[PDB]
DNA sequence: TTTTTTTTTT
């Protein structure tokens, strides 16, 4: 992944231990991140064009899965 | 088809491959979009006046159909 | 209380006086800060790189909890 | 009013006609300034250490309340 | 209007072509100068007590409006 | 002259 802030992009992936991190940020995920969930996240934010650090992007991904899976 | 964010408008349409996209975002559609579902979505969001990129609109349409057809 | 501006770092804590100050600043919290809320706050601002006085860091944490918990 | 350039301090207060000043400077305030809003402001800038004239401090409070109430 | 350096005073105004100047100095004002922004600028600098040439005052206004409207 | 973290018709 790039250093510093950057816009979301198609082959981006969170860290292997992403679920661990999400737990540490108060989001307990039962099942792993599916290819579809990630593709949808990336599409949305790639369009938006805002820029963030890798770890902030992962925080956005966790918050998004939490809302996504409540429904 | 405008570039950038835009408010929804009456002759708006999702891409021709919309059904495959929806699948890639984790929305499996067994029926194609109807002119009535699309008019309903457009009328709602046109009034609202909120602005989004084309791809984000298409995600809103996918989510909206999922919910709508579940009922 | 720590002195001078400083970047956010992993072991940072707002003092035991934090809930008190938050109330003096118009943010009334029912329950204490969770390890997770804090971890999440730290991760975000540590990546951001910005530098602040302790009290200022505390106000940002208060504002964040207020928003966070409104959901 | 406090004189010269100065650092923010606990007992600081804007003028009684602060509301109308804020309007003159393009910040239309529906309600008056609360105790907590002021304590929050004062804490922030007291830590920061920067020094300003009283009126400038009042302009900073006006800009801040605007942002804060949105 | 006064020649040479002078302290800011309540009735001060910039030139009628102030928008064109501001563009020459790199500040493109999508909107012109409001009476309020002006009073705000005057109260600030009148308090500050510094003296400047008319054209220097006009540069301070222009830089100011740039920063003030960047929000 | 510079205080202001935030995907979801239901």
Residue numbers in the entry:
A (entry chain B), B (entry chain D), C (entry chain A), E (entry chain E): 84 to 154
D (entry chain C): 84 to 153
Text lifted from the article:
Except for the dT10 ssDNA ligand, there are five molecules that display as a C-shaped helical assembly in one asymmetry unit. The protomers are similar to one other, having a root mean square deviation for the Cα atoms of no more than 0.3 Å; each protomer contains a three-helix bundle that has the α3 helix flanked by the α1 and α2 helixes. The five molecules are mediated through dimeric interfaces between each two adjacent subunits. Taking the A and B interface as an example, the interaction interface is mediated mainly through the α2 helix in subunit A and the L1 loop and the α1 and α3 helixes in subunit B using hydrogen bonds and hydrophobic residues. The ssDNA binds in a hydrophobic and positively charged cavity at the junction between different subunits of the DnaT84–153, with each protomer binding to a 2-base unit using the α2 and α3 helixes. The phosphodiester backbone is recognised mainly by Lys133, Lys143, and Arg146 through hydrogen bonds, while the 2-thymine-base unit is stabilised through the hydrophobic centre formed by Phe124, Tyr127, Trp128, Phe135, Arg146, Ile150 and Gly151. The Tyr127 and Ile150 stack against the two bases from each side of the two bases directly. Each base of the 2 bases stacks against the other, and all of the 5 DnaT84–153 subunits bind to the 2 bases in a similar way. The 2.83 Å DnaT84–153–dT10 complex structure showed a unique ssDNA binding mode that is different from any of the known RNA binding motifs.
